[PDB]
């Protein structure tokens, strides 16, 4: 009431693209507990890595690392089907417990992180200033990662829809889709947002019949 305890920086986890995703927002009063459900990046993923992050930078690699831990024993499924409920719990002692739970498999992995862990009074302000300085480069990095994932989704989605469509797909259409995907996958290996969007434009146009089918 004369004071508060507040997280001076956001806490969260690395998500595909190497982007920090916040669970506890900066200047939050402890005790506190936020949860969020994530999934797998790739088919038949047996495990997820949980890399824990302090800071306000959109790149995970510009934030302070607090720890990382695996959750294995993910029973095989498609991408983005498993439910991995991640919880940030800071108790009244300034201690953070991060848990990851496979909501099907019942499995659970925690890490506890000392109140004293992370960046001290000085490094904090340096991080906060840095966030405002490189706020541009970060908005850009973010929409590049959002674009990569869209492209990535649209790649995986399309390949699946080529198999379920099987013979229904006119040879021509396949050839054309086949190669637009190969171009996409290459450009996804790049850093060039425009180029990823271009192979995404290319696929939209050549897939128009593959979609007609998939609707069935």
């Amino acid at each position: 009431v004369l004071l508060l305890d507040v997280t001076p920086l956001s806490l969260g986890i690395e998500t595909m693209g190497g982007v920090m995703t916040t669970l506890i927002a900066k200047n939050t009063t402890i005790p506190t507990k936020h949860s969020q459900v994530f999934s797998t990046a790739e088919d038949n993923q047996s495990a997820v890595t949980i890399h824990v992050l302090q800071g306000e930078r959109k790149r995970a690699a510009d934030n302070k690392s607090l720890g990382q831990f695996n959750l294995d024993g993910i029973n095989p499924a498609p991408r983005g089907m498993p439910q991995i409920e991640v919880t940030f719990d800071i108790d009244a002692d300034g201690i953070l417990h991060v848990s990851a739970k496979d909501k099907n498999s019942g499995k659970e992995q925690k890490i506890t992180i000392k109140a004293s862990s992370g960046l001290n009074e000085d490094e904090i302000q340096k991080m906060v200033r840095d966030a405002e300085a490189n706020a541009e480069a970060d908005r850009k990095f973010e929409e590049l990662v959002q674009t990569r994932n869209q492209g990535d989704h649209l790649l995986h989605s399309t390949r699946k829809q080529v198999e379920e469509a099987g013979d229904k797909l006119p040879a021509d259409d396949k050839t054309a889709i086949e190669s637009a995907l190969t171009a996409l996958e290459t450009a996804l290996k790049g850093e060039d947002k425009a180029a990823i969007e271009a192979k995404m434009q290319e696929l939209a146009q050549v897939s128009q019949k593959l979609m007609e089918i998939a609707q069935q």
Binding site: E14, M16, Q36, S39, T40, I50
Partner: peptide, 6 residues
Amino acid sequence: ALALLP
């Protein structure tokens, strides 16, 4: 959702 790698 949002995803992670192993």
